[PDB]
Design a protein around this nucleic acid. Structure first.
Lengths: 101, 247, 91, 72, 126
RNA sequence: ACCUCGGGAAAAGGAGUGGCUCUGACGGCGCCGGGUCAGAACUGGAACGGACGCGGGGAUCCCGACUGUUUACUAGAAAC
RNA sequence: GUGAAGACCGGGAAGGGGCGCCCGCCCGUCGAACGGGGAGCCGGCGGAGACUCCGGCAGGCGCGGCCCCCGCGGAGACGCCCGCCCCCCGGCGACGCGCACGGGGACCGCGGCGGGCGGCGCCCCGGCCCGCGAACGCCCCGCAGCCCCCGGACGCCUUGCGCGGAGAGGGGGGCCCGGGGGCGGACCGCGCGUCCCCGGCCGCCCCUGAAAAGCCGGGGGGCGCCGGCCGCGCGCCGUACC
């Protein structure tokens, strides 16, 4: 009648990295599986919006295709930000010519 | 006797500034060849909060003139500056809020803040919330500009000294009552161990010159000479006058 | 409605404490701090305070420096005008 | 552990890649529709559940003499 | 009526963002939206060679939403629309041969120093 | 009463409360799933928060506005 | 740099490396068995231990052999098995408190069926015990959120809100989701709570809630990788018990 359990971690102090999830094992016992803190996906350098297409896994265990977006400045800039950058650059050069002409 | 609180404070040690988690030293961009001739363009990446400062700070990113990267400056933010503003620091800079120009260039009557006491000091006067200095006059023969410090005192500073156009943001912060002792503890925790304050007439004879008797009284006059000794200067130092009055 | 008849509208929390003068002053500052202000870009009344001096428009996604309890302070409004008049005059 | 792609990839791995042992575990708990073939590789143990004993036989046919079978 | 065959534009969305592209046909306005057939430089020539010059050009022929392309003053007039068509490009194959032909057409121009504004990369400062 | 209009206030002061047998509500429909809120009869040495848990209240006067802090091992105060 | 010294104080001082060069102001192999970190699960075994043994099954990081070989798809948001070095720019590491509300997991309780009991003066299909499924690997879903494409409006919506000509609703999509299912590893239904995690908010502050190692994108230059498969390796110290 007791499903109380004991700590899996080196010390009992329950910090952010010391959280457990209880499941029943094949042998009918409650086991404490560790819950890893979810790493977070890259956020756009300009703006602050999470970059679409990249999973929230540590980048080392991801695979190169998964850790990249097929776009110029892909994991750095979101598409709206990139289109603003492209447009701003093109317009500046076009106004400069008008100043000369 | 015992060393008084003022004496114990100068060794730091518990009375040292709580400077952890403070963004950095807010300072005007360094004077450079491109500042001295022409203007450098920066973009305000962010406007954030300094732990012990009421006035908001601002991360402005300038291009690296020396090399190839981008350099980030921390500036006390004038009111009205926004993220994605273009701030120009230069001798040829337009008079818009945020821009840093030498005080000779700044016209008379202009509200300025983060003014340099001496050229290339990267910031000194008018750095607190709401505070500003005003350009009073320029002597173009002495290359000096009179400014009125927020105190009212008029200072003649070199025309070369730089200042950020505008009034520091955070204006009217002390208008709100602290209301509770708790709100005070939160403000001082971000600053230094100076609060709570025990009156010297509350302390025993050893601890303070005001000390203690059968009744809580200042004993001799609170006014102390300017040439007092370091543990004796405790009340009103060198008071020209005391008391509430008209004006 | 009008749950608080007097000007204890935001200061009902303080209850019977702190004195009338403090509560009256807090009414003005508190109402100003939690008010929505109009962003000079979004032009939408969505600016709210993040910290003392920092105001963000939720739609425009732009942060602007401001007064501790109001997006715009009276001294600042005057300074912007003085700087504009002096600027236009210099050019 | 994983499920091998039909006997398509299972027989391809059996032909060359590690196939240290195959186990024809029919009658897992005496249950029907139960021929489970468990290929041991270096990378993973793979299991294809096959509908009939005759279906299992076609995959057992062509099992290498070098490939080792065990039956449960 | 800005959108016309022979307009140089800057692609703004997709993998071809920031590239310069030329419209060879203005696809008729339809429920999908307004679209045009765009042929443009996916990759610029190359780097050092010998000294500065004493090396390949890649092109993309894809249909693209006009909203995703910013109009510019440049031209790059070529006959072009004889080979590039709606049945082609959509076709798997034929498009690859059409791309190959455009790649050669582009290299001839760059070697003969024609249409340099089109053949220079738009600098996107971060 | 008073009040700084937030309080005072659980002011003060009354009345009921069990068990049985029901009856409505409420989402739930292929009707299926709730356990609370009412209302009702019939009961019973004149019982029912039946143990347990769990403000006595009011009228003032003096201090200190308040929540806080303090003499570990005689002073928690009106002192700080 | 001081001081009679013991000692104390400290950036302004030709401060890093191979060959031809090149690049380069200037310290922590200090400090945390709770902070950050590349990766562990199940079943068993012993008189004394186990995330350590043993049996299975996996994950991490490197060293070699062999083979292969330098991008495509989309209207877009994305998708897809993918190079490395330098310099620049960025990201992840990385973060407060709260009332609610939602979603999972465990727990709990209720039936049913299957197995095992106990009592029985009368009743009892009314009592009790048991009915197990881990990391991991593929495939599929996953609210809210964030985007895309058409198009051009009083609507869409929450518990509370909030949202929309800077583009709502509607229609079709993309992404993330510490999760769920299916198979592999290897009993069936239902409900109310509790606890823990998580989400989208909303509130709050003269209070704004660490840093770095490491890892990974991006721009520009250089420049050839990349993978796959098969072996091997993983040293040091702590580990009884209270």
């Amino acid at each position: 009648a007791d499903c109380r359990v004991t700590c899996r971690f080196h010390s009992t102090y329950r910090t952010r990295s010391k959280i457990v999830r209880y499941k029943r094992t094949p042998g009918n016992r409650l086991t404490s599986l560790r819950v890893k803190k979810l790493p977070n996906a890259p956020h756009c350098a300009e703006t602050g919006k999470q970059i679409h297409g990249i999973p929230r896994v540590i980048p080392q265990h991801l695979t190169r295709q998964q850790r990249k977006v097929s776009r110029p400045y892909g994991g750095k800039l979101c598409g709206s930000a990139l289109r603003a950058h492209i447009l701003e650059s093109f317009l500046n050069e076009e106004n400069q010519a008008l100043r000369e002409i | 006797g015992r060393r008084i609180r003022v004496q114990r404070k100068g060794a730091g040690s518990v009375f040292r500034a709580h400077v952890a988690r403070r963004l950095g030293a807010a300072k005007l961009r360094a004077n450079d060849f491109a500042e001295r001739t022409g203007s450098v363009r920066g973009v305000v990446k962010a406007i954030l909060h300094d732990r012990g400062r009421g006035a908001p700070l601002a991360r402005v990113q300038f291009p690296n003139m020396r090399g190839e990267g981008r350099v980030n400056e921390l500036f006390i933010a004038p009111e009205g500056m926004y993220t994605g503003q273009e701030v120009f620091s230069g001798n040829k800079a337009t008079l818009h809020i945020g821009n840093i120009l030498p005080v000779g260039n700044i016209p008379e009557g202009t509200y300025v803040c983060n003014v340099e006491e001496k050229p290339m000091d990267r910031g000194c006067l008018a750095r607190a919330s709401g505070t500003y200095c005003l350009v009073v006059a320029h002597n173009m023969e002495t290359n000096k500009t009179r400014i009125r410090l927020p105190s009212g005192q008029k200072k003649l500073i070199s025309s070369k000294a730089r200042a950020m156009i505008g009034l520091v943001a955070g204006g009217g912060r002390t208008d709100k009552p602290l209301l509770k002792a708790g709100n005070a503890y939160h403000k001082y925790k971000a600053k230094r161990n100076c609060w709570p304050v025990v009156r010297g007439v509350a302390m025993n004879p050893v601890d303070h010159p005001h000390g203690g008797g059968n009744h809580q009284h200042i004993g001799v006059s609170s006014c102390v000479p300017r040439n007092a000794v370091p543990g004796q200067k405790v009340g009103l130092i060198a008071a020209r006058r005391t008391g509430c009055s008209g004006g | 409605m009008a749950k608080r008849t007097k000007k204890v509208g935001l200061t009902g929390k303080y209850g019977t404490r702190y004195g009338r003068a403090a509560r009256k002053q807090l009414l003005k500052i508190e109402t100003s701090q939690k008010a929505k202000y109009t962003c000079p870009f979004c032009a939408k009344d969505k600016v709210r305070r993040t910290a003392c001096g920092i105001w963000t428009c939720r739609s425009c996604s732009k942060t602007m420096a401001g007064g501790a309890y109001s997006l715009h302070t009276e001294p600042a409004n005057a300074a912007r005008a003085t700087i504009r008049r002096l600027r236009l005059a210099r050019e | 552990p994983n499920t091998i792609t039909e006997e398509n990839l299972m027989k391809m791995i059996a032909d060359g890649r590690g196939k240290k042992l195959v186990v024809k575990s029919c009658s897992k708990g005496r249950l029907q529709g139960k021929v489970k073939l468990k290929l041991r590789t270096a990378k993973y143990l793979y299991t294809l559940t096959v509908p009939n004993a005759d279906d299992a036989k076609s995959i057992v046919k062509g099992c290498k003499d070098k490939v080792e079978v065990q039956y449960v | 009526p800005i959108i016309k065959p022979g307009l140089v534009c800057i692609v703004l969305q997709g993998r071809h963002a920031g590239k310069k592209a030329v419209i060879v046909e203005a696809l008729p306005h339809n429920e999908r939206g307004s679209y045009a057939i765009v042929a443009g430089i996916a990759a610029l020539p190359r780097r050092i060679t010998n000294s500065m010059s004493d090396g390949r050009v890649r092109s993309f022929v894809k249909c693209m939403n006009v909203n995703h392309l910013m109009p510019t003053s440049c031209r790059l007039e070529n006959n072009y629309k004889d080979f590039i068509s709606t049945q082609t490009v959509a076709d798997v194959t034929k498009r690859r041969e059409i791309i190959e032909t455009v790649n050669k057409d582009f290299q001839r121009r760059i070697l003969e120093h024609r249409d340099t504004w089109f053949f220079t990369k738009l600098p996107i400062d971060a």
